[PDB]
Symmetry: none
Subunit: 152 residues, 2 copies
């Protein structure tokens, strides 16, 4: 049972905490609980780095060990870091649970030490018209992020 936790920092409204859980090499479970977001859909990703020296900007692109194109968590075409959209409710609040099989807490593909980033806009899932669709799903700015710290 490995465990991680990202405490979200933001310059805009955004607060919250995101817990990760992995038993053996079963899937990782990410349970998130967040506030200060515009109702609707927001991109949610594991970026490649946890360099926070320029805030969320310095955390690099989506965690992509497999060198693949951007997709939804449900695609075979997909970054590892692609957790899709989280649905923000009317009160600015999201409270979700995602189970994924590409964001391990242990080993050489570990996301421990990396950042999760919530985005201003919906993730395209690689399918919008846009120039950035197949690399970022064109989700706009990095509105909150925290480094995935090892938890006890």
């Amino acid at each position: 049972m490995a465990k991680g936790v990202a405490v979200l920092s933001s310059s805009e409204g955004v607060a919250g905490t995101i817990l990760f859980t992995q038993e053996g090499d079963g899937p990782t479970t990410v349970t998130g609980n967040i506030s200060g977001l515009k109702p609707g859909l927001h991109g949610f990703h594991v970026h490649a780095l946890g360099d926070t020296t320029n805030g969320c900007m310095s955390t690099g692109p989506h965690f992509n060990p497999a060198g693949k194109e951007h997709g939804s968590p449900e695609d075979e075409t997909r970054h590892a870091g692609d957790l899709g959209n989280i649905t923000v409710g009317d009160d600015g609040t999201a409270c979700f649970t995602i189970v994924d099989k590409q964001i391990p807490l242990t080993g050489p593909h570990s996301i421990i030490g990396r950042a999760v980033v919530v985005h201003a806009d919906p993730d395209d899932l690689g399918k919008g018209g846009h120039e950035l669709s197949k690399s970022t799903g064109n989700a706009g700015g990095r509105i909150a992020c925290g480094i995935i710290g090892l938890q006890g």
Copy 2:
């Protein structure tokens, strides 16, 4: 891979960072993220010099090794620095990527050590009919800038 990074200063509350990237001698990709700006279109150019002894003002006109008049980035008649407009959203942030062929990161025409400047108003693109359309795109007003430094 050549890399560049400009950190914005302003006396007007604009903040941001702008990244540049160029594989070998393909186009340069510029990815920026900026805050503290009036919503709507702002002209966005690479300027000739990286001289900030008098602020944004000492950075010269638009970067222009070919000696052309001002245009849109998609025109033949175009300064090298003619990067068009960025769109600032209702929160006063802009998050954007521009791919361009005339702003290299290496060689004689390299933009490294030059400045990138955000302007108060929209760029004309040379089509506004103003006496300054063919020079500044009537965007006029330097509201933040940053010298393009070498990145790791």
